[PDB]
Amino acid sequence: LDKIAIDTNILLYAYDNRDLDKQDRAVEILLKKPFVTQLVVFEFIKVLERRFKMDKKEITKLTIKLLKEVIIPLSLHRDIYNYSQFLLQRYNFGLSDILVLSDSILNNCTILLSEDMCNGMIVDKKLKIVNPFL
Amino acid sequence: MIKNILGLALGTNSIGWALVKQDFENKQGEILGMGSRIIPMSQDILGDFGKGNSVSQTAERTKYRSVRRLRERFLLRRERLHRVLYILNFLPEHYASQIDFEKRLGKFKVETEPKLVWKNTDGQFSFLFQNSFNEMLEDFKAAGQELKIPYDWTIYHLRKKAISQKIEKEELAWILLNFNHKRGYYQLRGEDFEEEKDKTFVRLKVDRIVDSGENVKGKILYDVYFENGWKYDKQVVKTEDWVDRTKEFIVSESILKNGETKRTFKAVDSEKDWIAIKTKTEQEIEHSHKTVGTYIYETLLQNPKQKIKGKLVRTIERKFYKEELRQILEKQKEFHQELQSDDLYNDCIRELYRNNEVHQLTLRKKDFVHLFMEDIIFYQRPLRSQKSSVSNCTLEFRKYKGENGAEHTQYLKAIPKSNPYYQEFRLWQWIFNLNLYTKDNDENVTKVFLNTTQDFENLFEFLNTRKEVDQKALLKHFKLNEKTHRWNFVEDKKYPCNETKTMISSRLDKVENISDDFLTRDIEQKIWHIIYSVNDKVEYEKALKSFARKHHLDESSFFEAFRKFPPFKSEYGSFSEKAIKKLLPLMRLGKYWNYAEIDKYSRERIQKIITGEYDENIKDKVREKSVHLTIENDFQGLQLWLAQYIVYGRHSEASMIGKWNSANDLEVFLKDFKQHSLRNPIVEQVITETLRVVKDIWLKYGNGTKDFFNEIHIELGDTRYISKYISGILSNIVRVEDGSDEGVNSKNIVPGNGKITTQLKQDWGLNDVWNDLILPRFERMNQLTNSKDFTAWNENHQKFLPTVPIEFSKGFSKKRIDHRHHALDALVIACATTDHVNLLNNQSAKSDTKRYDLKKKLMKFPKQFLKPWEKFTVDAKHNLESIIVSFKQNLRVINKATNYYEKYVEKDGTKNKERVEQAGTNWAIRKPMHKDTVSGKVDLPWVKVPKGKILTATRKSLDSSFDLKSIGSITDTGIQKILKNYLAFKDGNPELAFSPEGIDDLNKNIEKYNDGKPHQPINKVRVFELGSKFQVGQTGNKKGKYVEAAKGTNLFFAVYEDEKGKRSYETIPLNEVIERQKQGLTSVPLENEKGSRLLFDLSPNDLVYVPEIDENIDSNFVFSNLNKEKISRIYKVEKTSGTECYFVRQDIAYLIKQYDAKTKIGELESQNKLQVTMTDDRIRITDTCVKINCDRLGNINFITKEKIKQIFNEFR
Ligand SMILES: [Mg+2]
Secondary structure (H helix, E strand, C coil), X not given: CCCEEECHHHHHHHHCCCXXXXXXXXXXXXXXXXXXXXXXXXXXXXXXXXXCCCCHHHHHHHHHHHHHHHCEEECCCCCHHHHHHHHHHHCCCCHHHHHHHHHHHHCCCCEEECCCCCCCCEEXXXXXXXXXXX | CCEEEEEEEECCCEEEEEEEEEXXXXXXXXXXXXXXXXXXXXXXXXXXXXXXXXXXXXXXXHHHHHHHXXXXXXXXXXXXXXXXXXXXXXXXXXXXXXXXXXXXXXXXXXXXXXXXXEEEECCEEEXXXXXXXXXXXXXXXXXXXXXXXXXXXXXXXXXXXXXXXXXXXXXXXXXXXXXXXXXXXXXXXXXXXXXXXXXXXXXXXXXXXXXXXXECCCCEEECCXXXXXXXXXXXXXXXXXXXXXXXXXXXXXXXXXXXXXXXXXXXXXXXXXXXXXXXXXXXXXXXXCCCHHHHHHHHHHHCCCCCCECCCECCCEHHHHHHHHHHHHHHHHHHCHHHHCXXXXXXXXXXXXXXXXXXXXXXXXXXXXXXXXXHHHCCCCCCCCCHHHCCEEEEEEEEECCCCCCCEEEEEEXXXXXXXXXXXXXXXXXXXXXXXXXXXXXXXXXXXXXCCHHHHHHHHHHHHXXXXXXXXXXXXXXXXXXXXXXXXXXXXXXXXXCHHHHHHHHHHHHCCCCCCCCCCHHHHHHHHHHHHHCCCHHHHHHHHHHHXXXXXXXXXCHHHHHHXXXXXXXXXXXXXXXHHXXXXXXXXXXXXXXXXXXXXXXXXXXXXXXXXXXXCCCCHHHHHHXXXXXXXXXXXXXXXXXXXXXXXXXXXXXXXXXXXXXXXXXXXXXXXXXXXXXXXXXXXXXXXXXXXXXXXXXXXHXXXXXXXXXXXXXXXXXXXXXXXXXXXXXXXXXXCCCCCCCCCCCCCCCCCCHHHHHHHHHHCCHHHHHHHHHHHHHHHHHHHHCCCCCEEEECCCCEEEECCCHHHCCCCCHHHXXXXXXXXXXXXXXXXXXXXXXXXXXXXXXCHHHHHHHHHHHEECCXXXXXXXXXXXXXXXXXXXXXXXXXXXXXXXXXXXXXXXXXXXXXXXXXXXXXXXXXCCCEEXXXXXXXXXXXXXXXXXXXXXXXXXXXXXEEEEXXXXXXXXXXCCECCHHHHHHHHXXXXXXXXXXXXXXXXXXXXXXXXXXXXXXXXXXXCXXXXXXEEEEECCEECCCCHHHHHCEECCCCCCCCEXXXXXXCCCCEEEEEECHHHHHHHHHCCCCCCCCEECXXXXXXXXECCCCEEECCCCCCCCCCCCCCCCCCHHHHHCEEEEEEEECCEEEEEECCECCCCCCCCCCCCCCCCCCCCCXXXXXXXXXXXXXXXXXXXXXXXXXXXXXXXXXXXXXXXXXXX
16 A cells, blocks of 8 residues: 665664664564665665675675565666755755665655654655654 | 958847958958847747737736636635634535635635535435425416426525525525625726716617718718607618618717707627627616516526526626625515624624734624625725836935945836926926917017016916916917917917816815815815825715815815816826926026025035036036026026036936946846836847847857957848837947947947848849759759749859749748848848948939949949958858757746735734745746646547547537538437438538528427437537547546647657667656656656667757768767758757657748648648658658757857866866
């Protein structure tokens, strides 16, 4: 009835097990086959290679498995840059966050399951940011 | 020595420029460049601006705005009625349940279509007023016609019923809302005319026409006699249309002073003239002596089939509705105690005017009748004040420091021409300007009969008592005669003579019962203020009564005299009242001449000029003119110019010459140019684009260097007034400041004329150049026509010249079928030295020796004029074949708009009404969204509908234009069959079958064509069409309206190419463009759903290049080596539909022959433009075209290394 997208922190909490409860929440969210934008995937890959020091081959295998089974990747939209420019007029987020929001909105996503994005307010009256850990 | 010449040819919508650097002394010159700027108007505007009929975009914009404003006013009235009725609790429960009263007060709730007389429950609709319906059933039964009636006829019956019986509160609500919905014609001004205002519409039959013996132009005229005893004032010539015929006129009877009616006659036509229909309905209601609603009822009683709205009573005076509605409210006010309550009347007033204490307190003294009539339903706003557009005084200035930390000047508004000060000033001017002449010796007899101040004082005092001086009065004032003297002016013309004072004196004598001392200057000014300030009838009455009350005068006949005072004419003087008050003491002479009333500045200046000392504001011109002002008393009988210089210190209007040091001044002036500052928009836009192109050329070819231009020449070719204005504007560039070039216009600006242009074109070979340049279209026309008539050989030049057959020579013109004749004319005007135009305008010399020098220097012996240099023809032809035309585009889809609305804002603890800007962003669509005609979606089983299309149908009137197939294109199959039967009976002749009389014959004998079954009469039929029409909107019933794309809104045409190379084309609807631009995206999607990258979008008046078939252009770039062929392969988008895009060769302006349906021959076939190249190759342009962008000057712009450097040098 309404599309759902996720942010990189959801995948990071699903993988990392320092806080078990948030990991369980993230796994539960992933169980519903949520859509995802390629920017989130690239950020996830960068974080895994940098923060968790996993080698290239296992990271690529994990990404391929996740995209094949768990989550649905979203095709990159050609209007991401113009819309990101438009969104910057009213909203003051990070540029990467703005790009994530623009690609989510351009693909008719209505919920963006994120944490570090000041959950609660609607975005352009098309999408809303929800923190699932609260 | 070396001269720079800028020739400009300004057409109706085209601007041809030519800049040339030449050396006349050595016969050496080269052409710097030329170009043409085309402002795209369709041929309709070109054919219309000669006469003018709503020829403006702003006119239609204002029309739409006014319609919307009326609609919004009606909606606001309905909202207020809903609020009042709810707070009084008169509406039915279900009706009140569906209306908001908390946030959107009085508005229907979202997705609701409530009705007052219909209640919904479990999907069933039931009528609400059963007893009234039964009562109307009993009426009809008494009438005895039928028992079958719609439930919604009860409104008229109950409107009549409320006159003498009690009805429910819901009844009152329904009647009030219906009255709101239908207000009626009205005039705000009032100003009641003659007591009669007969204007009676009657139909009279002529009995006999007795010959009146008026033999004019070999024909004797008759008179007209009617049965009542009236005669037509005008004569009658043709007796065929006047004998024993019933002629109807609207007649007005006026009681003349002699004591008999002066009846007027004016031809009127029934159901064709708005005034005639209005008067007929007026009289029909009047002689019935009943309310208009009652008249409609009675008509329904007589004939149930009679339609009411738009046919029976369309237009009547608002006073009729006012009378009926009052009568019903005063009748019902007795029965309903609520209409006499006061708590509810205070509550509703507070609801309507919560933030207005004043209006609340005022209205707390009225009754509900006043609220329903004069405050809600019949309230009409007064005209908006027009004083904001009044011109400013050119003499009086005020200097003040604003909030912006500066000190700037506010001007003084112009004095009204009806001001007694202005009237006195004009009268003094005329009296002083008077000089007399005699008839015997025609000598200047003035200064003899008018020498001393006493005579001028007597003339002024005599002219005060009159309203308009003329020949007889002026001659009699001096005891002179008509046969012996005149007054130097028109012997049969009259001039204003301060009529306001005389009229006031006449009225103040008509009131009587007072002394002859009430009227004075203060009283005259106060009377002028009272009448002119209060421009409202009832408030004027109140002001007159108050004026009569304050002064100790009887208010018995003064009010009657002053109530019919004519409103003052709308006219304002050049100066203001301050200037006239300052100047008037100086002009007057005698006892009216006084030194005390003069201000400090003028008195000090007079003292200085009589002293003879030196002031920095005194020139030798002053002492030359004012040498006769030796004493301060000599300032008697002064004139406007001398007194003006004495008061202010400037001699008349000498302008400021003006010099523009660079393009900065020109661009500042362009930015500060005010819109709608000319006669018509076409001229102002032409001038603005001329200024733009001259700015661009100066910036490019001057490179920021002042005085680069030396001479500018202007050619025009209705449009005559623009010459002086453009000369004045362009004088500010090449003006010479040393004093050798002074005046209103610079001597450098040399206007041209057609004579010199055609003479030089024929003599200098330019006509031959044009003919050979335009030939290729002509031999192509010959080839397609399969005839040789379009090119004719000549032996005097030994070549083929263009020609046209006579049937196509109606509006044919060789020079007008290519956009480059403007540049050619600019070039010929530029090289046309002032000697050429002076010689051709001064051919009459009276001596051969005076002009033989010019004959030798400019004309090659009187045979042919010399060329400016050796290579004139070659350079001209090469540049004409190597030029590209630049088109101005209008692609405004959406734009930002600002809304300022009145609201009671809370500040400093108090409420104040003030302007508030609308919150958020509100875009304004700059194009018509769709066509006006609305179609509804229908489905028919007997028509196969392909996917991607829908069936839509709309009503059409029945007429002879219906053939067999058209009948086959009707939604109602039974109607199709009946029409087929009737047409068969009419032998398949649509003209005779579907005549209005034939339509009535069908309607009355509809049984004979429906196999004896009953059917209703036919007037309109819904015709269908299988197409693709989109929806108007998405809320309410806007989803049920289907419309077609408006004219000239297919702005964007997208061309994509997939990975392997195939090109795809789409057309973006205006709705998608609007949404994309609102979201901040670009107009055309970057990527079609097919998965192809967007190559480019195309807009009307865009330029594309079609490469040769052999060559492959992928990254050619290099758009500076534009030779003949490359430029000749440049096309322009003209229109677009679906995946079809139409192009025209960019140099083609008018087709040699347009397409016709009979012969089916045209230069560019049926569409007047081809989807492919015009030449023999016939290759689809869109498959290989490449988009090209150009500046104003027609220069191709392509990426360079420097551009790539700068594109992000700017972000650093
Ligand atoms: Mg992020």
